[PDB]
Amino acid sequence: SRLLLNNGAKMPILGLGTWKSPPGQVTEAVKVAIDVGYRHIDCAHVYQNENEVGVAIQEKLREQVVKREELFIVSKLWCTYHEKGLVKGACQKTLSDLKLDYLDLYLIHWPTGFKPGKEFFPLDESGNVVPSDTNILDTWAAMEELVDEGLVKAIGISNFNHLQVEMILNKPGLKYKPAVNQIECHPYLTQEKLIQYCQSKGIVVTAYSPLGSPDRPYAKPEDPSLLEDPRIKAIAAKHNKTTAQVLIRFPMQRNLVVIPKSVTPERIAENFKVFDFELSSQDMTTLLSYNRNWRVAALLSCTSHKDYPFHEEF
Numbered sequence: 117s118r119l120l121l122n123n124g125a126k127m128p129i130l131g132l133g134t135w136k137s138p139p140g141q142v143t144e145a146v147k148v149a150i151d152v153g154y155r156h157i158d159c160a161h162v163y164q165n166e167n168e169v170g171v172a173i174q175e176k177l178r179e180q181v182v183k184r185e186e187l188f189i190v191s192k193l194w195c196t197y198h199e200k201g202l203v204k205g206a207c208q209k210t211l212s213d214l215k216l217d218y219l220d221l222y223l224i225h226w227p228t229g230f231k232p233g234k235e236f237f238p239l240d241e242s243g244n245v246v247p248s249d250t251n252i253l254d255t256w257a258a259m260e261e262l263v264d265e266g267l268v269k270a271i272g273i274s275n276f277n278h279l280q281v282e283m284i285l286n287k288p289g290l291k292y293k294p295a296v297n298q299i300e301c302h303p304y305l306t307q308e309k310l311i312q313y314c315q316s317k318g319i320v321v322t323a324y325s326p327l328g329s330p331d332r333p334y335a336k337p338e339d340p341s342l343l344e345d346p347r348i349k350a351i352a353a354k355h356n357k358t359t360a361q362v363l364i365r366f367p368m369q370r371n372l373v374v375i376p377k378s379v380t381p382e383r384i385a386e387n388f389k390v391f392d393f394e395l396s397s398q399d400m401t402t403l404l405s406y407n408r409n410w411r412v413a414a415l416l417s418c419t420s421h422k423d424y425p426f427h428e429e430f
């Protein structure tokens with residue numbers, strides 16, 4: 117039900133994602149989620165809805181439905197705030213929008229640093245993304261002091277390949293190990309090598325886009341759909357469960373934290389009923405065989421960035 121992190125904290129294996137969740141629908145979505153039983157919410161400054169997520173959290177706290185210690189709130193540092201002096205300020209902005217005094221987990225959203233400014237994806241006259249000269253090690257040291265100041269209880273990373281994780285682990289004077297590495301994971305991108313590597317170093321893996329993210333903006337009619345895969349429908353039918361429920365239970369049995377997104381009350385409730393059944397070892401091996409190495413989030417505009425994470429095998 118909860119996984120143990122290297123800072124001694126317990127992280128709910130199931131959480132609610134908020135990317136693409138409209139500001140006018142997410143407050144109600146988070147409220148319903150908390151009522152249903154969710155104790156983990158995944159957020160990010162770049163989602164432009166943290167203020168609205170925060171309204172939900174504050175309402176449930178005032179209502180006594182949950183106490184702060186029961187909730188596990190996660191947010192992420194955007195690429196335009198990688199410089200030393202900007203990290204504390206970005207965390208503080210997120211804390212105010214969410215209306216909390218500490219975050220349970222703060223992740224470096226992407227290993228790529230962009231030029232600071234108002235634009236999330238700063239461009240030049242040619243049209244490509246302008247990088248920052250900062251590196252992963254300097255940004256990590258800034259994340260470490262947020263723990264020393266009490267702003268966050270744990271720090272982690274997101275979309276980091278194995279070599280980038282190595283860099284941090286082998287950094288001189290390392291004070292806090294990354295507690296979590298949140299990566300894209302589902303049956304079409306199983307990530308067996310990155311997962312095995314992270315797990316061997318005591319780093320918890322969080323799987324994002326577990327349903328294949330059918331609502332991504334760059335969606336094409338010829339792209340593969342997990343929710344409609346006949347082979348996955350068969351396994352679901354065999355268990356008297358929905359395909360989404362199977363796609364959510366899949367990573368849990370691999371000892372991964374899963375964070376499916378939804379703004380629909382019935383779906384939010386449906387996605388929660390995944391603790392009452394088990395996928396057989398055969399079901400797990402079969403699902404793993406469906407890997408096509410297909411990524412939903414490839415950050416294609418940063419293919420030339422010095423820190424792009426997807427050139428390495430894992």
Ligand SMILES: NC(=O)c1ccc[n+]([C@@H]2O[C@H](COP(=O)([O-])OP(=O)(O)OC[C@H]3O[C@@H](n4cnc5c(N)ncnc54)[C@H](OP(=O)(O)O)[C@@H]3O)[C@@H](O)[C@H]2O)c1
Binds near residue numbers: 133324329
């Ligand atoms: N760290 C990173 O770089 C990063 C990147 C991507 C995502 N994430 C996190 O991962 C979270 C989840 O990934 P995601 O948002 O890309 O997509 P996802 O959870 O894989 O899929 C969300 C989509 O599936 C639909 N859905 C949810 N439950 C369903 C069900 N039971 N039956 C049918 N359809 C269902 C949702 O529709 P409705 O909402 O309409 O119900 C929505 O369209 C994000 O919100 C975010 O918090 C992190």
Ligand SMILES: O=C(O)Cc1ccccc1
Binds near residue numbers: 162163
């Ligand atoms: O990185 C993410 O979580 C998804 C995302 C893609 C493009 C713009 C904002 C967020």
